[PDB]
Amino acid sequence: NIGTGDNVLHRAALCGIIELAGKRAKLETALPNFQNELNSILELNMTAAEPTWLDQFRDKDDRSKPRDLTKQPLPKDTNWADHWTAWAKAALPLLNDETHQAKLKEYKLAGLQPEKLERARNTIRRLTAEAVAKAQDPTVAESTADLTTEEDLQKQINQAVYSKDTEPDDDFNGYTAFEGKASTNRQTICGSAVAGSKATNAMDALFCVCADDRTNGADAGKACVAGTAPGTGWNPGVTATPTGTMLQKVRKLCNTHGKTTLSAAAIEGRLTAVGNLLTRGSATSILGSFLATDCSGDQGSGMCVAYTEVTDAKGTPTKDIPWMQKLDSVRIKLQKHERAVEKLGKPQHDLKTILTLAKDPAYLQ
Amino acid sequence: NIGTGDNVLHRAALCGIIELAGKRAKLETALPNFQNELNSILELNMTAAEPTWLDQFRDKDDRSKPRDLTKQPLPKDTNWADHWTAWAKAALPLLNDETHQAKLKEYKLAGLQPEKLERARNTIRRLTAEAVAKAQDPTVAESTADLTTEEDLQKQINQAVYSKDTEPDDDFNGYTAFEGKASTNRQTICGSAVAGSKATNAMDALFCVCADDRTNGADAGKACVAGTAPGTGWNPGVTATPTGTMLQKVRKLCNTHGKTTLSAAAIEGRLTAVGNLLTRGSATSILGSFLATDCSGDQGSGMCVAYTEVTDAKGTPTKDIPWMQKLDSVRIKLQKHERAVEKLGKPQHDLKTILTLAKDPAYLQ
Amino acid sequence: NIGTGDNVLHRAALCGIIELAGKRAKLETALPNFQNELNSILELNMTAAEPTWLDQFRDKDDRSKPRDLTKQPLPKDTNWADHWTAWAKAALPLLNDETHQAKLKEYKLAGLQPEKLERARNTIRRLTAEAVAKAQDPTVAESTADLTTEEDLQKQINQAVYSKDTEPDDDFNGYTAFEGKASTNRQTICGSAVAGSKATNAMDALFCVCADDRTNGADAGKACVAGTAPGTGWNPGVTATPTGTMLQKVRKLCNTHGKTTLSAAAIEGRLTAVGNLLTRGSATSILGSFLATDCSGDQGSGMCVAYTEVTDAKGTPTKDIPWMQKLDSVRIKLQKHERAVEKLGKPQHDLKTILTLAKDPAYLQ
Ligand SMILES: *[C@@H]1O[C@H](CO)[C@@H](O[C@@H]2O[C@H](CO)[C@@H](O[C@@H]3O[C@H](CO[C@H]4O[C@H](CO)[C@@H](O)[C@H](O)[C@@H]4O)[C@@H](O)[C@H](O[C@H]4O[C@H](CO)[C@@H](O)[C@H](O)[C@@H]4O[C@H]4O[C@H](CO)[C@@H](O)[C@H](O)[C@@H]4O)[C@@H]3O)[C@H](O)[C@H]2NC(C)=O)[C@H](O)[C@H]1NC(C)=O
Ligand SMILES: *[C@@H]1O[C@H](CO)[C@@H](O[C@@H]2O[C@H](CO)[C@@H](O[C@@H]3O[C@H](CO[C@H]4O[C@H](CO)[C@@H](O)[C@H](O)[C@@H]4O)[C@@H](O)[C@H](O[C@H]4O[C@H](CO)[C@@H](O)[C@H](O)[C@@H]4O[C@H]4O[C@H](CO)[C@@H](O)[C@H](O)[C@@H]4O)[C@@H]3O)[C@H](O)[C@H]2NC(C)=O)[C@H](O)[C@H]1NC(C)=O
Ligand SMILES: *[C@@H]1O[C@H](CO)[C@@H](O[C@@H]2O[C@H](CO)[C@@H](O[C@@H]3O[C@H](CO[C@H]4O[C@H](CO)[C@@H](O)[C@H](O)[C@@H]4O)[C@@H](O)[C@H](O[C@H]4O[C@H](CO)[C@@H](O)[C@H](O)[C@@H]4O[C@H]4O[C@H](CO)[C@@H](O)[C@H](O)[C@@H]4O)[C@@H]3O)[C@H](O)[C@H]2NC(C)=O)[C@H](O)[C@H]1NC(C)=O
Ligand SMILES: *[C@H]1O[C@H](CO)[C@@H](O)[C@H](O)[C@H]1O
Ligand SMILES: *[C@H]1O[C@H](CO)[C@@H](O)[C@H](O)[C@H]1O
Ligand SMILES: *[C@H]1O[C@H](CO)[C@@H](O)[C@H](O)[C@H]1O
């Protein structure tokens, strides 16, 4: 018969999911950013430019004001419109003569007389073109990795766990278990050898696996605990939908008090643990201790949740069980993010190198 | 006594292995390829070359035909033989004058009068030499990562699971359990506290851990299931070797219906799960529920598989148990592949950058 | 009641920790080193330099002796002091004229007459400056990844497992279980629903979870084994602290005979397994089978270890349980090491590329 601690294995696997929710899942690493370095290289290039080039960025009436492109349209026989935004950003502080001199000193160009500045400028123009070319990576720009944020991943985790973008508070305010579909009795809610559960997310699955009820506190209702049953008072034959107080008595078995570093490997391992614990039968697969007939909570029956999407003839948990597929999608996005972090480190290092060379007076000559 | 669900933990660990077999294990990422970019850079260089250089690639009698190296041997006072294959590949489409002009336009060289083309050619020759140098990585070329394919890894997984290059069909056609060595009774086949099993692969281990037999359908034969026993009808005291129908009734407890993204971390975690479930004793280590004496299938005995290669005094599963060592070898090859993917991303980005610069008329001048 | 094999799950999780100790944990990959290549590039540059530059590195009285900087101080109107150590290292073998000629040949410079050597030298000086700039990565230099060694990580693992820098031998010489704090009886040592254990490390936790004692050899003392109890003879009501012989009878359930490839993912998975097996109650969390009251070793009580740092209202194992936090710190250091390996591969490839170009006579011209 099912008794104290018999579902510790399944509780551990499901709490490995629940612990990821809320705002607890955190990315190891942000995508490398090198815009600062690119902007500095472009500004250094503008600082080294001939005065007549910087003058193109000035208003014709006030040399300290940036050129207005309605007042002074860009010539259509050039490609200047293709580059103006970046050039104007580099030029803006330099329109002030004192700031231009301060930038000359910052970039180690202030010691150069005209012919030596021309020599340096030739190298700088080459280095700057190389920086712009290297800072392009069409395989990352606008990709999944670039468009996906940590907040986006957290919301998707909360969708898998709670069917909501945010984790319910300790009273489960705003949340209705089983999507409002609970009815009849525990085995109707949690499933059986022939029918699936009404649980669409991980938290309601955990509730089916671990909640005590009015009739099993002496035995099966201790399946997920050490000694004291959770004490939900759930009475699904009378009131099918558990209250928020009941849900929280089960959620507090899980680690909701810290953070988790999001990695694809960490999600993969958690999904593999849950997925392979599913016991495949002819019409359903069962998560949790099961001895006979259904997941009714009786010590001779089961403390479990059942799925019809996966059986001994069909189905893959991470594709066919919606909440698991949602988390697998997070895994895939993390794989893309991790590859983008590796790839973007290259232009980051390249641009730091170029800035070093561009500030090296001997190299420039 | 051993009863329903008592081996769910061990079944889950072993099905985590079986699910990798067939063609289900898939690489996250192919090795970055940059041959397209290198070939384009070499072709651009040939397009920019002086006409007398391209003429070296022509037959002396028909200028549209590539030079034949028996008819017109390469001069031995040059290094041309060291480079001819790549040069001739770049030159081949360009031998047609109209195609040469089309390539000049494709590569943004068609606007250049002779002196400006010479200036551009100087930069292109430098960029092309840099591309060739960067496209070399002797630490990846001909390495394990380069020589190992996804098909190779799948075959090695199937060797660990089935001792075959391909996964047996649903009737286990062509397969003989226990390498034909099963005899006597279940405990002889599956092992004991004093002797090892006849199972050399993971599928036959799973069979020992999870198969019901004629005498345990009411009890221990339900160790891996929820309710209904698998129904093999195995009768090893009369006919020791199980049939393909019997094997499939156990294999269908595992997820053979989807795919798995092969990563070193995913294999490591699966091997660590199995390896640490091995219960080390004085003469054997046991995988599966075990109460007394041997893995006979009796509810008072064990539903398990035993190994003599690992004990409480010696042995490491991933080195000393052949099927686990075969999968650990896959893990090692995946680590090398993953490092090669990271390393090859560098020349890939470098060559894309060079192509950008080589097609930039302002940079070339 | 707790009996044979009931703690196999918890033993497996804890042995996944113990197996990392000793010197068994090994890094997949050393940080890429490119000092050899940088040194070669600097030496090639010095080999190509004009004789009057190499002469700056000679003693004024013996041209085969390196310049002494007290005898011949460096001019303060130069930056030579900022570069002297690297230059002098490059110059040292070259002070011998025959060795200088041998290096000219090694670096493919010996075919160059003066004007062609000057042309090559211009390119070499540029390539060498680029190599120096690329070989800088301030995000790795003196970072956690750079300062952390494999020995350092092994010692930290042994601190988590044993509270010592090195793993105790097979007699546990030099080791005292429970930090010398064991007293009274098993439940005082191992904890309960109301009090924490005296175990501060993973090995003593494993002892609480898996040791038999004088009164449970027929039942609960078999929780971690297959058949034969460990046979410690522990009698904590009389002599609380177990002996080294007793500790070794439990440690030998774990894989202490092989090696483990240290990765952040491998540690993360092991910590997640242990952490989520902790059964959270009102005043303590319990690792191990637990039926009633305390971890006394009685078959009706528990074979377990308790922690007050984590409960159903507070605490995260990898932050608040010291031994788990120590191992989580290893995970974090491994993440930094793994990122440094990826990042340092870039300058490694860059410097190999530069060496190739610098030894290419056609490129240099
Ligand atoms: C780092 O800092 C440097 C400055 O030190 C900065 O350099 C500037 O780069 C830009 C972009 O490469 C250069 O832009 C070119 O400008 C010329 C000159 O335009 C003026 O003078 C002409 C001639 O008198 C006038 O007609 C014109 O109205 C302007 O007054 C333009 O001629 C260039 O445009 C042609 O070439 C481009 C390709 O390079 C084409 O994309 C473009 O469509 C134009 O082609 C057309 O005209 C061609 C005539 O030769 C013809 O051949 C084509 O068929 C077609 O009809 C171009 O816009 C600018 O001169 C540089 N400034 C200086 C002072 O040198 C770098 O940009 C900066 N680096 C970075 C990365 O920001
Ligand atoms: C991008 O596109 C460019 C073209 O724009 C292309 O350039 C070609 O590169 C190759 C390889 O670097 C150059 O090959 C050289 O060719 C010369 C000339 O050979 C002809 O003329 C000589 C003299 O009249 C004849 O003797 C000969 O029979 C040919 O008719 C060769 O002299 C070169 O070989 C020597 O130098 C090499 C090192 O660079 C040695 O490896 C080789 O063994 C040779 O050395 C021998 O002779 C030397 C004489 O100087 C002597 O010093 C040595 O001791 C030894 O005895 C070399 O083969 C070719 O000229 C380029 N073409 C043009 C038009 O410039 C790039 O290859 C392409 N980029 C890529 C990456 O594909
Ligand atoms: C690869 O191999 C090459 C050799 O082929 C090697 O090149 C050497 O590089 C170093 C470092 O860049 C060069 O060092 C410079 O040396 C000059 C010359 O000093 C002598 O001659 C002067 C003039 O007669 C004397 O005054 C002096 O006492 C020496 O006899 C120095 O003038 C340079 O120092 C000034 O410029 C530096 C910036 O580049 C400043 O950091 C430094 O503070 C100095 O500035 C001061 O003086 C300036 C005068 O112009 C003035 O403008 C400033 O305001 C300030 O007052 C510098 O030390 C050396 O010449 C190169 N050797 C050759 C033969 O070319 C590469 O180093 C090597 N590559 C690598 C990476 O190792
Ligand atoms: C589950 O199975 C038990 C044992 O047969 C039965 O008593 C319950 O009614 C059922 O839900
Ligand atoms: C396994 O152990 C049981 C219990 O003692 C015994 O009945 C079987 O014969 C043996 O194989
Ligand atoms: C643990 O619980 C059992 C069962 O009530 C009791 O007999 C022991 O004394 C206690 O330590």
Residue numbers in the entry:
A (entry chain A), B (entry chain A), C (entry chain A): 24 to 388
Could you give the paper's own sentences about this structure?
Long-term immune evasion by the African trypanosome is achieved through repetitive cycles of surface protein replacement with antigenically distinct versions of the dense Variant Surface Glycoprotein (VSG) coat. Therefore, at the heart of antigenic variation in the African trypanosome are the NTDs of the VSGs.
NTD structures of VSG11 and VSG615 were solved to 1.23Å and 3.2Å resolution, respectively. Both reveal a fold similar to VSG3 as well as the presence of O-linked glycans on the top surface of the protein–one observed on VSG11 and two on VSG615. In addition, alignments of the VSG11WT-Iodine crystal form with the VSG11WT-Oil form show that the second helix of the three-helix bundle displays a significant conformational change in the region near the middle of the bundle, the helix becoming disordered and forming a random coil in one monomer while keeping helical structure in the other.
